[PDB]
Amino acid sequence: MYDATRINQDLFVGGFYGDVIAMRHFVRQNNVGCVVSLIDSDVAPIKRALYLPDGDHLHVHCEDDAKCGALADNLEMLFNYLWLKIHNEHKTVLIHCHAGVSRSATLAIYYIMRTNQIDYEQAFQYVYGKRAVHPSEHFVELLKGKCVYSYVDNKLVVRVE
């Protein structure tokens, strides 16, 4: 009963509540190949308990605070990590924070926005249909800020950067 949800064939989103054994049980039972930890707490115990091979556990220290830019600062690196684990190494990814509703959900939504070239509201509803998420307002503006709307042939086409 570790609280994480399958979002699509490639991604899980969840939290962390201090029971690494439950988390390890979820990861191993569900064949999760890679874990991204987006937390402001100590990650070494999670890394140790999961014991994944070198390179299959990534940590970015980041807060959920209109003041911390660390998730935004690392969005490109995080995206490329997911893309290479999913497409080149064929792994599923657990993205987690503490509650699994804002930090982790923000990266999952962005991965779906950019791989599908769809806007925030479309990706958010897709994810929210599988797990009730609620990105903080500044993460919503971050993700919306990645979308460009360009005029062509009497339409506005969205591009996700």
Residue number with CB closer to Ca ion (14 or 33): 14
β-pair partners for 151: 156
Does position 97 bind Ca ion by CB under 5 A?
yes
Does position 60 bind Ca ion by CB under 5 A?
no
Q: Which residue's beta carbon is nearest to the bound Ca ion? A: 98
The minimum distance between CB 99 and Ca ion, in angstroms, equals 4
Helix (H, G, I), strand (E, B) or coil at 136: coil
Does position 158 bind Ca ion by CB under 5 A?
no
Select the residue interacting with Ca ion from 85, 91, 98, 114 (CB under 5 A): 98
Stretch binding Ca ion (CB under 5 A), from 54-62, 76-84, 89-97, 129-137: 89-97
Residue 27 class from Cβ within 10 Å (0-12 exposed, 13-18 middle, 19+ buried)? buried
Residue number with CB closer to Ca ion (68 or 158): 68
The minimum distance between CB 104 and Ca ion, in angstroms, equals 8
The minimum distance between CB 3 and Ca ion, in angstroms, equals 12
Contact 114, 79 (CB under 8 A): yes
- For 16-130, strand residue ranges (E) read 34-39, 57-61, 93-96
β-pair partners for 150: 157
CB atoms closer than 10 angstroms to residue 52: 16
Residue number with CB closer to Ca ion (62 or 123): 62
Note if 97 is an active site residue: yes
How far, in Å, CA of 125 to CA of 151, rounded? 25
Chain contacts with Ca ion (rule: CB under 5 A):
97-99
